UniProtKB/Swiss-Prot annotation:
The keyword DNA-binding applies. Keywords: DNA recombination, DNA-binding, Viral genome excision. GO terms for biological process: DNA recombination; provirus excision. Part of the excision complex necessary for the excision of prophage from the host genome by site-specific recombination at the att site. This is Excisionase. It comes from the Viruses. It comes from Escherichia phage lambda. The chain holds residues 1 to 53 of 72 of the full protein. Interacts (via C-terminus) with the integrase (via N-terminus). Part of the excision complex made of the integrase tetramer, IHF, Fis and Xis. The gene is xis. GO terms for molecular function: DNA binding; identical protein binding.
DNA sequence: GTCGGCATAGTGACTGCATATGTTGTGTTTTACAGTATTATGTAGTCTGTTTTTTATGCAAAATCTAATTTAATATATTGATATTTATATCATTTTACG
């Protein structure tokens, strides 16, 4: 039902580095926000990179 | 209310502070499969007694089928006037025949 960090970024237009994407998570730059499974984050299929300011 | 001249009026170019973004490097925390071992699994390889199915006769029940037999029905045989069918084959009308 959810999508892994890589499976979500791979679908993006400008696939950034893993670290950078992980940073948009701690900075709540992604809404709807992703949930932490065990060691990886599983975002939503409709989750988008909300760039504000 | 239009036409003529500096003042309006957002959008675009320009320059450097300010900060999220892009790398590099150390270090903790947990996922993820390989390899041997334990034991209840599902089918396997057969034996055995009960249930199921093929099988070999057995017999009262049922009335046709064949031969003995009698008789109405059928055939021969007359005789002779009168009524019906008869040989061929082109026209005409009824009934069979397939789609």
């Amino acid at each position: 039902m959810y999508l892994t960090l890589q499976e979500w970024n791979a679908r993006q237009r400008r696939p950034r580095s893993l670290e950078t994407v992980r940073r948009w998570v701690r900075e709540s730059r992604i809404f709807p926000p992703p949930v932490k499974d065990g060691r990886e984050y599983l975002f939503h299929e409709s989750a988008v990179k909300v760039d504000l300011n």
